[PDB]
Amino acid sequence: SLIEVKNLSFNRGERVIYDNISLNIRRGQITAIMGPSGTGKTTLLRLIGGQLVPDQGEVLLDGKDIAQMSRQELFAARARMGMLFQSGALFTDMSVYENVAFPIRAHTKLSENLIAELVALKLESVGLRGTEQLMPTELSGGMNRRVALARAIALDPDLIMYDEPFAGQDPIVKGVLTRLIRSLREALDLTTIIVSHDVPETLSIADYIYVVAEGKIQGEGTPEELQAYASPFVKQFLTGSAEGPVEYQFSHQ
Amino acid sequence: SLIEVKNLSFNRGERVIYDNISLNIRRGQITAIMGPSGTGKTTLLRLIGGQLVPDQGEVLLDGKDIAQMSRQELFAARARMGMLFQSGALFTDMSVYENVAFPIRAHTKLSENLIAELVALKLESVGLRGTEQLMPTELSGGMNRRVALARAIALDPDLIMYDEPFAGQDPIVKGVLTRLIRSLREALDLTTIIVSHDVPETLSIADYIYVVAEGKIQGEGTPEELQAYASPFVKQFLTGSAEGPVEYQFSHQ
Amino acid sequence: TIAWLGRLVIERIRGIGVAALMLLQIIFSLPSAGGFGRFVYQMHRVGVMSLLIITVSGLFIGLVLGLQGYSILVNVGSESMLGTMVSLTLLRELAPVVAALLFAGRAGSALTAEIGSMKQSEQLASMEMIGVDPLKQIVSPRLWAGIVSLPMLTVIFAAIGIVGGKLVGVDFLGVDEGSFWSGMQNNVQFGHDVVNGIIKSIVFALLCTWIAVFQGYACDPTPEGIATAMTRTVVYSSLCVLGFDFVLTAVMFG
Amino acid sequence: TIAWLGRLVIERIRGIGVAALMLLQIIFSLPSAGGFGRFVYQMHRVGVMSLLIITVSGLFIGLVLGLQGYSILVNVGSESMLGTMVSLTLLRELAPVVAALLFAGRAGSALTAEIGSMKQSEQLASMEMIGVDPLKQIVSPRLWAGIVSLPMLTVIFAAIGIVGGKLVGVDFLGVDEGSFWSGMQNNVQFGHDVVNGIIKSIVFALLCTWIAVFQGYACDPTPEGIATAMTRTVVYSSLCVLGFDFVLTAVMFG
Amino acid sequence: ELVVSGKIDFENAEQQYQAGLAIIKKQTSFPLIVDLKQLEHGNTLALAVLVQWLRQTPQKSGLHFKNVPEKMLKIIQACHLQEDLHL
Ligand SMILES: Nc1ncnc2c1ncn2[C@@H]1O[C@H](COP(=O)(O)OP(=O)(O)NP(=O)(O)O)[C@@H](O)[C@H]1O
Ligand SMILES: Nc1ncnc2c1ncn2[C@@H]1O[C@H](COP(=O)(O)OP(=O)(O)NP(=O)(O)O)[C@@H](O)[C@H]1O
Secondary structure, X not given: OOEEEEEEEEEEOOEEXXXXXXXXXXXXXXXXXXXXXXXOHHHHHXXXXXXXXXXXXXXXXXXXXXXXXXXXXXXXXXXXXXEEOOOOOOOOOOOHHHHHHOOHHHHOOOOHHHHHHHHHHHHHHOXXXXXXXXXXXXXXXXXXXXXXXXXXXXXXXXXXXXXXXXXXXXXXXXXXXXXXXXXXXXHOOXXXXXXXXXXXXXXXXXXXXXXXXXXXXXXXXXXXXXXXXXXXXXXXXXXXXXXXXXXXXXOOO | OOEXXXXXXXXXXXXXXXXXXXXXXXXXXXXXXXXXXXXXXXXXXXXXXXXXOOOEEEEEEOOEEOOOOOHHHHHHHHHHEEEEOOOOOOOOOOOHHHHHHOOHHHHOOOOHHHHHHHHHHHHHHOOOOOOOOOOHHHOOHHHHHHHHHHHHOOOOOOEEEEEOOOOOOXXXXXXXXXXHHHHHHHHOXXXXXXXXXXXXXXXXXXXXXXXXXXXXXXXXXXXXXXXXXXXXXXXXXXXXXXXXXXXXXXXXX | OOHHHHHHHHXXXXXXXXHHHHHHHHHXXXXXXXXXXXHHHHHXXXXXXXXXXXXXXXXXXXXXXXXXXXXXXXXXXXXXXXXXXXXXXXXXXXXXXXXXXXXXXXHHHHHHHHHHHHHHOOOOHHHHHHOOOHHHHHHHHHHHHHHHHHHHHHHHHHHHHHHHHHHHHOOOOOOOHHHHHHHHHHHOOHXXXXXXXXXXXXXXXXXXXXXXXXXHOOOOOOOHHHXXXXXXXXHHHHHHHHHHHHHHHXXXXX | OOHHHHHHHHHHHHHHHHHHHHHHHHHOOOHHHOOOHHXXXXXXXXXXXXHHHHHHHHHHHHHHHHXXXXXXXXXXXXXXXXXXXXXXXXXXXXXXXXHHHHHHHHXXXXXXXXXHHHHHOOHHHHHHHHOOOHHHOOOHHHHHHHHHHHHXXXXXXXXXXXXXXXXXXXXXXXXOHHHHHHHHHOOOOOOOHHHHHHHHHHHHHHHHHHHHHHHHHOOOOOOXXXXXXXXXXXXXXXXXXXXXXXXXXXXXXX | OOOOOEOOOOOOHHHHHHHHHHHHHOOOOOOOOOOHHHEOOOOXXXXXXXXXXXXXXXXXXXXXXXXXXXXXXXXXXXXXXXOXXXX
16 A cells, blocks of 8 residues: 655644655555654654544545545555554453454454454464463563554554554564564565664664654655765764754853 | 672562672773663662662672661761662652752751852753753653753762663663763763663663673673673673574464 | 633633533444443443442441431430431432442542543554444443442442441330331332432432543543542532532422 | 452551551651741642632532421421531531541542652652652651641531521521521530531541552552552542541440 | 862851852952862862852952862863863
């Protein structure tokens, strides 16, 4: 799926978060978004996903305007994507079986026997075959997050979004998630979006990167191009360098 | 001064967090601790001679056992430490001026004129001159950390502990915190402790590093030396490789 | 300076408008009967888990009414009056208020906290993309458990209060079982001393639970807000129960 | 299976022992070491901020008692009883209970959340690292501000309630005023019944605030812990007030 | 000329502070030059005292950068308190 985002504008109450963002989410590629903390990275994914109302913006799924879709078109469209949220978004009241199985009931009418087999396959694909029937609250950190991902890929969606996957602190986990993204990207022909922090980990994964700050695109390119055209904002941002366009209060008498 | 911890053992919640830890904190040097999350990093710092009581072992400051020896000395001795706990604490009911001023009142009896001047100097040392009358709750995240640090160095302490300062942030901030540490270790002749998950930053800052996991020290050295002794645990940990002594849960059938 | 109050009032009242709109949607359209088979589960945390508190309070209230009634009524007619006053007090004013407030506390703050977390963790939000409307899946069975549970608890509170009253008023303090029971029958009418207790209970059950759901489902995703929401659900349903209790009793027995 | 309950009971009672120990450590009058400006300030949040809620509640309770008393008294034909009963009901049983439950209640919940937040946030840990014992800064003025505030609010509640009672009982419903004031004097007194109302509120103030402090402060830092603690304070505060109300009223007027 | 020498600690900050104020009360212009190398090192509050002293006569450029101890100038430079105080 190719997703067009044009002239995006969005305010949260009176505050402007975005101001005419223009994105091309390229088919079969990994795209990524980087930027300063708190500049609406998650807001942008929510708008792309159609869960927020854009202000005069245009969002197209395979060329179709989401604002013009009928209830059935929208409902069916939901089965085209899955997302992994920043906290993991697991349901505490259900065991792992239901947490992964759950979205299947939104679109299909299957026998319990086939539902169970899909759950088993999806858990195996991420190394969770042995967690069956345990409550999610009893999982260790790495396992907890892997379950949530299993839900996102449960329906064989075209698009997977990862919201802050590299914010995990454990070097071991960073290793595993990097591998899962690459593994799943190939196995399922996925288009993916990585929205994160700590640059040493998105610059080696994405095929194409946008740098976003203060509601504007600050530059775009492949990792190489961003360095080549690294406007000072971008340059210091990607470098993690001091003495960029960063201010603090100062005057003396 | 030098701090020594020997044969440390500590059991919390019926589980042992630490088992015969032996540390040598070198004077004037940066000592750092790395390891998997959830393994006692905060706890070990607290057991340096804070509010936690070990089951076995000793804590020595200047070679003296702090346990029992004596009340008045210990009260005064406490003036030699400053810390940033996790996210960093600010008191919400106090202005920035008061948060920095606060520890002064624990050990001194000064005129309003001098307490005010010390606050002004300490805020400038971290780039916060002129923000004294704002309530801390109105600060951006980058400033919350800097205010808390100004408090930590308010009394001209000898030991500064940074509890997970690099764990999760903005690359701009990482640049600033790194610089503040470099500036202050020299300006104030400090001994510092950096405890952090983000291995790539720790490796270029510390003079000496301990790798701690599962309650034991699993290797020690300057960063150059740790790279020379590839115990499978330490090697995977310091490289981010997903392969090594870690687990996944599966068995086909 | 002064305009601050102005803004506070304006926004709080806007919020009531929102609450009204939310209530309309949850009650107005609920076609997903297949998933409502679970509300019986939900009831576990509203009704089943609250009997211990309602029962213990009902006993203490009954015993207190017994002792105070008696020390006043020995000068007027305990033989006839313990029966009539214990039963009318519990049926008309206390079961509908004491149970309503204990409930607002124990079930109310717990429920709002739970919705609050569902929102704060972003867990709830993830359902929108799965096509499962959270109002029909998360909110519906919670509001209904509240409606059924409080009225049944209200009756139990009174049942225990009667045991309490008799236990001291008749059995330890020297009064006739005969006139206690007949006195109650002579003055307590099903229509409408028992019935009005139930009507007030339904009104409170809806109002009180409605508020707990509404505040838990808060706008602002800040951790500080959970504690604020919990305090507010207790305060607002508490005043609303007392305000509406006044008007309803004024009509029912005026 | 069964042992689960057993473990729960054992841990809750152990916790009581800890709470008792904490109360002993805090109660010694040690806070004089610092200024008390902090106390005056703290009183703002526990007392002054709650006057609106307790006042509105007192007015509705007064008006309700007025209407219920009247619709019973018209069947005795003895209207002088409005004075005697509005006063005794509020002074002996309702001001000490309604005020205690609305108080903690709101102040109870908010205080629990605030101290607990300071534990979760690491603010308290920092203070010990600095060298200022947190019990003398964070806990002390909160426990005492609660002790002074509730008893004072109890009085206001009753005062509003009596006035509300007269407002309907005498002024809208046609009762000769002289019998109202005389009925109050005949025979409830300032030197006895008012005094017992206050004593009960001192006891309740300690139970409510003591629990609220304990629940916030004394807990290992589990992230879900704040919401649970807030609910727990409301439940324990409430049962303790009713359990003690029974034993005290049983003596004061027995 | 008149130098408040020795160690400025927190405990005696008040008296060292007043001694300097007495020197200022007996004001000169150019302000008297103080040899700060007569002070014990490692005390930031010594600076707080010195700053307040200069600020009692803020209109006067009473700067003596040459007499500043190396440790004192290092904290000044590290903290952006550097000003052209050369003479
Ligand atoms: N209804 C609402 N009213 C007010 N604020 C809201 C509402 N819903 C969500 N929030 C806003 O949601 C925004 C989300 O974007 P953001 O603050 O940048 O977080 P984020 O993307 O996870 N940050 P980061 O992890 O650095 O990328 C916040 O700024 C909140 O104010
Ligand atoms: N006071 C306490 N009493 C009992 N259990 C606690 C207490 N505090 C926290 N917990 C547990 O004890 C440990 C707290 O310290 P610690 O392991 O050092 O955290 P940490 O490693 O810094 N956490 P993190 O920053 O996420 O990696 C964890 O294992 C908690 O589950």
